[PDB]
Amino acid sequence: GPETLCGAELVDALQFVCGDRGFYFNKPTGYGSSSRRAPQTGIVDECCFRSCDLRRLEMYCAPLKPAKSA
């Protein structure tokens, strides 16, 4: 939920979780030619407008051990 970090701040957000936990920028995406395939909505869509933090990154922080967003 509502914790808004944009641009540089959104990178910083990503870092403070997946800086150790491993990265993967799930937009509504896998990687490459990947289409619309996450109700999660978007990396940017979340972190800059709604959800980013320790919990509310993982899906798009990267979801490597926990599939975690809220």
Coordinates of all heavy atoms in Angstrom, one line a residue:
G1 N 0.8 -1.2 0.0 CA 0.0 0.0 0.0 C 0.8 1.3 0.0 O 2.0 1.2 -0.3
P2 N 0.2 2.4 0.5 CA 0.7 3.7 0.1 C 2.0 4.2 0.7 O 2.1 4.5 1.9 CB -0.5 4.6 0.5 CG -1.1 3.9 1.7 CD -0.9 2.4 1.4
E3 N 3.0 4.0 -0.1 CA 4.4 4.4 0.1 C 5.2 4.6 -1.2 O 5.6 3.6 -1.9 CB 5.1 3.5 1.1 CG 4.8 2.0 0.9 CD 4.2 1.4 2.2 OE1 3.0 1.5 2.3 OE2 5.0 1.0 3.0
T4 N 5.2 5.9 -1.6 CA 5.5 6.3 -3.0 C 6.9 6.9 -3.1 O 7.4 7.8 -2.5 CB 4.5 7.4 -3.3 OG1 4.4 8.4 -2.3 CG2 3.2 6.9 -3.7
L5 N 7.7 6.1 -3.9 CA 9.1 6.4 -4.2 C 9.3 6.4 -5.8 O 9.1 5.3 -6.4 CB 10.1 5.4 -3.6 CG 10.1 5.5 -2.0 CD1 10.8 4.3 -1.4 CD2 10.7 6.8 -1.5
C6 N 9.7 7.5 -6.3 CA 9.8 7.7 -7.8 C 11.3 7.9 -8.3 O 12.1 8.4 -7.6 CB 9.0 8.9 -8.1 SG 7.2 8.7 -7.8
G7 N 11.5 7.3 -9.4 CA 12.8 7.4 -10.2 C 14.0 6.9 -9.4 O 14.0 5.7 -9.1
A8 N 15.0 7.7 -9.2 CA 16.1 7.4 -8.3 C 15.6 6.8 -6.9 O 16.2 5.7 -6.6 CB 16.9 8.7 -8.0
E9 N 14.6 7.3 -6.3 CA 14.0 6.7 -5.1 C 13.4 5.3 -5.3 O 13.7 4.5 -4.4 CB 12.8 7.6 -4.6 CG 13.2 9.1 -4.3 CD 11.9 9.9 -4.0 OE1 10.9 9.7 -4.8 OE2 11.9 10.6 -3.0
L10 N 13.0 5.0 -6.5 CA 12.4 3.7 -6.8 C 13.5 2.6 -7.0 O 13.4 1.6 -6.4 CB 11.4 3.8 -7.9 CG 11.8 3.3 -9.3 CD1 11.5 1.8 -9.4 CD2 10.9 4.0 -10.4
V11 N 14.7 3.1 -7.5 CA 15.9 2.3 -7.5 C 16.4 2.0 -6.1 O 16.6 0.9 -5.7 CB 16.9 3.0 -8.4 CG1 18.3 2.2 -8.5 CG2 16.4 3.2 -9.8
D12 N 16.5 3.1 -5.3 CA 16.8 3.0 -3.9 C 16.0 2.0 -3.1 O 16.5 1.2 -2.3 CB 16.8 4.4 -3.2 CG 17.7 5.4 -3.8 OD1 18.8 5.1 -4.2 OD2 17.2 6.6 -3.9
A13 N 14.7 2.0 -3.3 CA 13.7 1.0 -2.8 C 14.1 -0.4 -3.2 O 14.3 -1.2 -2.3 CB 12.3 1.4 -3.3
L14 N 14.2 -0.7 -4.5 CA 14.7 -1.9 -5.0 C 16.0 -2.4 -4.3 O 16.0 -3.5 -3.8 CB 14.9 -1.8 -6.5 CG 13.6 -1.7 -7.3 CD1 13.8 -1.0 -8.6 CD2 13.0 -3.1 -7.5
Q15 N 17.0 -1.6 -4.2 CA 18.2 -1.8 -3.5 C 18.1 -2.3 -2.1 O 18.5 -3.4 -1.8 CB 19.1 -0.5 -3.6 CG 20.3 -0.7 -4.4 CD 20.0 -0.9 -5.9 OE1 19.0 -0.5 -6.5 NE2 21.0 -1.5 -6.6
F16 N 17.3 -1.6 -1.3 CA 17.1 -1.9 0.1 C 16.4 -3.3 0.4 O 16.3 -3.7 1.6 CB 16.6 -0.8 1.0 CG 15.1 -0.2 0.7 CD1 14.0 -1.1 0.8 CD2 15.0 1.2 0.7 CE1 12.8 -0.5 0.9 CE2 13.8 1.7 0.8 CZ 12.6 0.9 0.9
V17 N 15.7 -3.9 -0.6 CA 15.3 -5.3 -0.5 C 16.3 -6.2 -1.3 O 17.2 -6.8 -0.7 CB 13.9 -5.4 -1.0 CG1 13.4 -6.9 -0.9 CG2 12.9 -4.5 -0.4
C18 N 16.2 -6.1 -2.6 CA 16.8 -7.0 -3.5 C 18.3 -6.8 -3.9 O 18.9 -7.7 -4.6 CB 15.9 -7.3 -4.7 SG 15.2 -5.9 -5.6
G19 N 18.9 -5.8 -3.3 CA 20.3 -5.5 -3.2 C 21.2 -6.7 -2.8 O 22.3 -6.9 -3.1
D20 N 20.6 -7.5 -1.8 CA 21.1 -8.9 -1.6 C 20.2 -10.0 -2.2 O 20.7 -11.0 -2.7 CB 21.3 -9.1 -0.1 CG 20.0 -9.1 0.8 OD1 19.3 -8.1 0.7 OD2 19.7 -10.1 1.4
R21 N 18.9 -9.8 -2.1 CA 17.9 -10.8 -2.5 C 17.8 -11.2 -4.0 O 17.1 -12.2 -4.3 CB 16.6 -10.4 -1.9 CG 16.6 -10.5 -0.4 CD 15.5 -9.7 0.3 NE 14.2 -10.4 0.3 CZ 13.1 -10.1 1.0 NH1 13.0 -9.0 1.7 NH2 12.1 -11.0 1.1
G22 N 18.4 -10.5 -4.8 CA 18.5 -10.7 -6.3 C 17.5 -9.9 -7.0 O 16.3 -9.7 -6.5
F23 N 17.8 -9.4 -8.2 CA 16.9 -8.5 -9.0 C 16.2 -9.1 -10.2 O 16.8 -9.9 -10.9 CB 17.6 -7.2 -9.5 CG 17.9 -6.2 -8.4 CD1 19.1 -6.3 -7.6 CD2 17.1 -5.1 -8.4 CE1 19.4 -5.3 -6.8 CE2 17.5 -4.0 -7.5 CZ 18.6 -4.1 -6.7
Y24 N 15.1 -8.5 -10.5 CA 14.2 -8.8 -11.7 C 13.1 -7.8 -11.7 O 12.1 -7.9 -10.9 CB 13.7 -10.3 -11.6 CG 12.8 -10.8 -12.7 CD1 13.4 -11.8 -13.5 CD2 11.5 -10.5 -12.8 CE1 12.6 -12.6 -14.4 CE2 10.7 -11.2 -13.7 CZ 11.3 -12.2 -14.4 OH 10.4 -13.0 -15.2
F25 N 13.1 -6.9 -12.7 CA 12.2 -5.8 -12.8 C 10.9 -6.3 -13.6 O 10.7 -6.1 -14.8 CB 12.8 -4.6 -13.5 CG 13.8 -3.8 -12.6 CD1 14.9 -4.4 -12.1 CD2 13.7 -2.4 -12.6 CE1 15.9 -3.6 -11.6 CE2 14.7 -1.6 -12.1 CZ 15.8 -2.2 -11.6
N26 N 10.0 -6.9 -12.8 CA 8.7 -7.3 -13.2 C 7.8 -6.0 -13.2 O 7.4 -5.4 -12.2 CB 8.1 -8.3 -12.2 CG 6.7 -8.9 -12.6 OD1 6.0 -8.3 -13.5 ND2 6.3 -9.9 -11.9
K27 N 7.5 -5.6 -14.5 CA 6.6 -4.6 -14.9 C 5.2 -5.2 -14.7 O 4.8 -5.5 -13.6 CB 7.1 -4.1 -16.2 CG 8.6 -3.7 -16.3 CD 9.0 -3.6 -17.8 CE 10.4 -4.1 -18.1 NZ 10.5 -5.6 -17.8
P28 N 4.4 -5.3 -15.8 CA 3.6 -6.6 -15.9 C 4.3 -7.6 -16.8 O 3.7 -8.1 -17.7 CB 2.3 -6.1 -16.3 CG 2.6 -4.9 -17.2 CD 3.8 -4.3 -16.5
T29 N 5.5 -8.1 -16.4 CA 6.4 -8.8 -17.3 C 7.2 -9.9 -16.6 O 7.5 -9.9 -15.4 CB 7.4 -7.8 -17.9 OG1 8.0 -7.0 -16.9 CG2 6.7 -6.9 -19.0
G30 N 7.6 -10.8 -17.4 CA 8.7 -11.7 -17.3 C 10.0 -10.9 -17.8 O 10.2 -9.8 -17.4
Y31 N 10.7 -11.5 -18.8 CA 11.7 -10.8 -19.6 C 11.6 -10.9 -21.1 O 11.1 -12.0 -21.6 CB 13.1 -11.0 -19.0 CG 13.5 -9.8 -18.2 CD1 13.3 -9.9 -16.8 CD2 13.9 -8.6 -18.8 CE1 13.4 -8.7 -16.0 CE2 14.0 -7.5 -18.0 CZ 13.7 -7.5 -16.7 OH 13.8 -6.4 -15.9
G32 N 12.0 -9.9 -21.7 CA 12.0 -9.8 -23.2 C 10.6 -9.4 -23.7 O 10.0 -8.4 -23.3
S33 N 10.1 -10.2 -24.7 CA 8.8 -10.0 -25.3 C 7.7 -10.6 -24.4 O 7.2 -11.7 -24.6 CB 8.8 -10.7 -26.7 OG 9.5 -11.9 -26.7
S34 N 7.4 -9.8 -23.4 CA 6.5 -10.2 -22.3 C 5.3 -9.1 -22.1 O 5.6 -7.9 -22.0 CB 7.3 -10.3 -21.0 OG 6.5 -10.7 -20.0
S35 N 4.1 -9.7 -22.2 CA 2.9 -8.9 -22.3 C 1.9 -9.0 -21.2 O 1.4 -10.1 -20.9 CB 2.2 -9.2 -23.6 OG 2.0 -10.7 -23.7
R36 N 1.8 -7.9 -20.4 CA 0.6 -7.6 -19.6 C 0.3 -8.5 -18.4 O -0.6 -8.2 -17.6 CB -0.5 -7.2 -20.5 CG -1.7 -6.5 -19.9 CD -1.5 -5.2 -19.2 NE -1.2 -5.3 -17.8 CZ -0.9 -4.4 -16.9 NH1 -0.6 -3.1 -17.2 NH2 -0.8 -4.7 -15.6
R37 N 1.2 -9.4 -18.1 CA 0.9 -10.7 -17.4 C 1.1 -10.7 -15.9 O 1.4 -11.7 -15.3 CB 1.7 -11.8 -18.1 CG 3.2 -11.6 -18.1 CD 3.9 -12.7 -18.9 NE 3.6 -12.6 -20.3 CZ 4.4 -12.9 -21.4 NH1 5.5 -13.6 -21.2 NH2 4.0 -12.6 -22.6
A38 N 0.9 -9.5 -15.3 CA 0.9 -9.4 -13.8 C -0.2 -8.4 -13.4 O -0.1 -7.2 -13.7 CB 2.2 -9.0 -13.3
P39 N -1.2 -8.9 -12.6 CA -2.1 -8.1 -11.8 C -1.4 -7.1 -10.8 O -2.0 -6.1 -10.4 CB -3.0 -9.1 -11.0 CG -3.1 -10.2 -12.0 CD -1.7 -10.3 -12.6
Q40 N -0.2 -7.5 -10.5 CA 0.8 -6.6 -9.8 C 1.0 -5.2 -10.5 O 1.4 -4.3 -9.8 CB 2.1 -7.4 -9.8 CG 3.3 -6.8 -9.1 CD 4.2 -6.1 -10.1 OE1 4.1 -5.0 -10.5 NE2 5.2 -6.9 -10.6
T41 N 0.8 -5.1 -11.8 CA 0.6 -3.9 -12.6 C 1.8 -3.3 -13.3 O 1.7 -2.7 -14.4 CB -0.2 -2.8 -12.1 OG1 0.4 -2.0 -11.1 CG2 -1.6 -3.2 -11.7
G42 N 2.9 -3.2 -12.6 CA 4.1 -2.5 -13.0 C 5.0 -2.0 -11.8 O 4.5 -1.3 -11.0
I43 N 6.2 -2.5 -11.8 CA 7.4 -1.8 -11.2 C 7.2 -0.3 -10.9 O 7.0 0.1 -9.7 CB 8.6 -2.2 -11.9 CG1 9.6 -2.9 -10.9 CG2 9.4 -1.2 -12.8 CD1 10.1 -2.1 -9.8
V44 N 7.0 0.5 -11.9 CA 6.8 2.0 -11.8 C 5.4 2.3 -11.2 O 5.3 3.0 -10.2 CB 7.0 2.7 -13.1 CG1 7.0 4.2 -13.0 CG2 8.3 2.3 -13.8
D45 N 4.4 1.7 -11.8 CA 3.0 1.8 -11.4 C 2.7 1.6 -9.9 O 2.1 2.5 -9.3 CB 2.2 0.7 -12.2 CG 2.3 0.8 -13.7 OD1 3.4 0.4 -14.2 OD2 1.3 1.3 -14.3
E46 N 3.3 0.6 -9.3 CA 3.5 0.4 -7.9 C 4.4 1.4 -7.2 O 3.8 2.4 -6.7 CB 3.9 -1.1 -7.6 CG 2.8 -2.1 -7.9 CD 1.5 -2.1 -7.2 OE1 1.5 -1.4 -6.1 OE2 0.6 -2.7 -7.7
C47 N 5.7 1.3 -7.3 CA 6.6 2.0 -6.5 C 6.4 3.5 -6.4 O 6.4 4.1 -5.4 CB 8.1 1.6 -6.8 SG 9.3 2.2 -5.6
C48 N 6.2 4.1 -7.6 CA 6.0 5.5 -7.7 C 4.6 6.1 -7.4 O 4.5 7.2 -7.0 CB 6.5 6.0 -9.1 SG 6.4 7.8 -9.4
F49 N 3.6 5.2 -7.5 CA 2.2 5.7 -7.3 C 1.5 5.1 -6.1 O 0.5 5.7 -5.6 CB 1.5 5.4 -8.6 CG 2.1 6.2 -9.8 CD1 2.8 5.5 -10.7 CD2 1.9 7.6 -9.9 CE1 3.5 6.2 -11.7 CE2 2.5 8.3 -10.9 CZ 3.3 7.6 -11.8
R50 N 1.9 4.0 -5.6 CA 1.3 3.1 -4.6 C 2.3 2.4 -3.7 O 2.7 3.0 -2.7 CB 0.3 2.1 -5.3 CG -1.0 2.8 -5.7 CD -1.8 1.9 -6.7 NE -1.1 1.7 -7.9 CZ -1.0 0.5 -8.6 NH1 -1.6 -0.6 -8.2 NH2 -0.4 0.6 -9.8
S51 N 2.6 1.2 -4.0 CA 3.4 0.3 -3.1 C 4.9 0.2 -3.5 O 5.2 -0.4 -4.5 CB 2.8 -1.1 -3.2 OG 1.4 -1.1 -3.0
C52 N 5.8 0.8 -2.7 CA 7.1 0.1 -2.5 C 7.7 0.3 -1.0 O 7.7 1.4 -0.5 CB 8.2 0.5 -3.5 SG 8.3 2.3 -3.8
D53 N 8.4 -0.8 -0.7 CA 9.0 -1.0 0.7 C 9.5 -2.4 0.8 O 9.2 -3.3 -0.1 CB 8.1 -0.7 1.8 CG 6.8 -1.5 1.9 OD1 6.9 -2.7 2.3 OD2 5.8 -1.0 1.3
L54 N 10.0 -2.8 2.0 CA 10.6 -4.1 2.3 C 9.7 -5.3 1.9 O 10.2 -6.3 1.3 CB 11.0 -4.2 3.8 CG 10.0 -3.9 4.8 CD1 10.3 -4.7 6.1 CD2 9.8 -2.4 5.1
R55 N 8.4 -5.2 2.2 CA 7.4 -6.2 1.8 C 6.8 -5.9 0.4 O 7.0 -6.8 -0.5 CB 6.3 -6.0 2.9 CG 5.3 -7.2 2.9 CD 5.4 -7.9 4.3 NE 6.7 -8.4 4.6 CZ 7.6 -7.9 5.5 NH1 7.4 -6.9 6.2 NH2 8.9 -8.4 5.5
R56 N 6.4 -4.7 0.2 CA 5.7 -4.3 -1.1 C 6.7 -3.9 -2.2 O 6.6 -2.9 -2.8 CB 4.8 -3.1 -0.8 CG 3.5 -3.4 -0.1 CD 3.6 -3.6 1.4 NE 2.3 -3.7 2.0 CZ 1.6 -2.8 2.6 NH1 2.1 -1.5 2.8 NH2 0.3 -2.8 2.7
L57 N 7.8 -4.7 -2.3 CA 8.6 -4.8 -3.4 C 8.7 -6.2 -4.1 O 8.2 -6.3 -5.2 CB 10.0 -4.3 -3.1 CG 10.1 -2.8 -3.4 CD1 11.1 -2.1 -2.6 CD2 10.3 -2.5 -4.9
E58 N 8.9 -7.2 -3.3 CA 9.4 -8.5 -3.7 C 8.9 -9.1 -5.1 O 9.8 -9.2 -5.9 CB 9.4 -9.5 -2.6 CG 10.8 -9.5 -1.9 CD 12.0 -10.1 -2.7 OE1 12.1 -11.3 -2.6 OE2 12.7 -9.3 -3.3
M59 N 7.6 -9.1 -5.4 CA 7.1 -9.4 -6.7 C 7.8 -8.8 -7.9 O 7.7 -9.3 -9.0 CB 5.6 -8.9 -6.6 CG 4.6 -9.9 -7.0 SD 4.3 -11.1 -5.7 CE 3.0 -12.1 -6.5
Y60 N 8.2 -7.5 -7.7 CA 8.9 -6.6 -8.6 C 10.1 -6.0 -7.9 O 10.7 -5.1 -8.6 CB 7.9 -5.5 -9.0 CG 7.1 -4.8 -7.9 CD1 7.6 -3.6 -7.4 CD2 6.0 -5.5 -7.4 CE1 6.9 -3.0 -6.3 CE2 5.3 -4.9 -6.4 CZ 5.7 -3.7 -5.8 OH 4.8 -3.1 -5.0
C61 N 10.5 -6.6 -6.9 CA 11.8 -6.1 -6.2 C 12.6 -7.1 -7.0 O 13.3 -6.7 -8.0 CB 12.2 -6.5 -4.8 SG 13.6 -5.4 -4.3
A62 N 12.8 -8.3 -6.6 CA 12.5 -9.6 -7.4 C 12.0 -10.7 -6.5 O 12.5 -10.9 -5.4 CB 13.8 -10.1 -8.0
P63 N 11.0 -11.5 -7.1 CA 10.3 -12.5 -6.2 C 10.9 -13.8 -5.8 O 10.2 -14.7 -5.3 CB 9.0 -12.7 -7.0 CG 9.5 -12.6 -8.5 CD 10.5 -11.5 -8.4
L64 N 12.2 -13.8 -5.7 CA 13.1 -15.0 -5.8 C 12.8 -16.1 -4.7 O 12.9 -17.3 -5.1 CB 14.6 -14.7 -5.8 CG 15.0 -14.3 -7.2 CD1 16.4 -13.7 -7.2 CD2 15.0 -15.5 -8.1
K65 N 12.6 -15.7 -3.5 CA 12.1 -16.6 -2.5 C 10.7 -16.4 -2.0 O 9.9 -17.4 -1.8 CB 13.1 -16.9 -1.3 CG 14.5 -17.4 -1.8 CD 14.4 -18.8 -2.5 CE 15.7 -19.1 -3.3 NZ 15.9 -18.1 -4.3
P66 N 10.3 -15.1 -1.7 CA 8.9 -14.8 -1.5 C 8.3 -14.1 -2.7 O 8.7 -13.0 -3.2 CB 8.9 -13.9 -0.3 CG 10.2 -13.1 -0.4 CD 11.2 -14.1 -1.1
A67 N 7.1 -14.6 -3.1 CA 6.1 -13.9 -4.0 C 5.3 -12.9 -3.1 O 4.2 -13.2 -2.6 CB 5.3 -15.0 -4.7
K68 N 5.9 -11.7 -3.0 CA 5.4 -10.8 -1.9 C 5.2 -9.4 -2.5 O 6.1 -8.8 -3.1 CB 6.5 -10.8 -0.8 CG 6.0 -10.4 0.6 CD 6.9 -10.9 1.7 CE 8.1 -10.0 2.0 NZ 9.0 -9.9 0.8
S69 N 4.0 -9.0 -2.5 CA 3.5 -7.6 -2.7 C 2.1 -7.4 -2.1 O 1.3 -8.4 -1.9 CB 3.4 -7.3 -4.2 OG 2.6 -8.2 -4.9
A70 N 1.8 -6.2 -1.6 CA 0.6 -5.9 -0.9 C 0.2 -4.4 -1.1 O -0.8 -4.0 -0.4 CB 0.7 -6.3 0.5

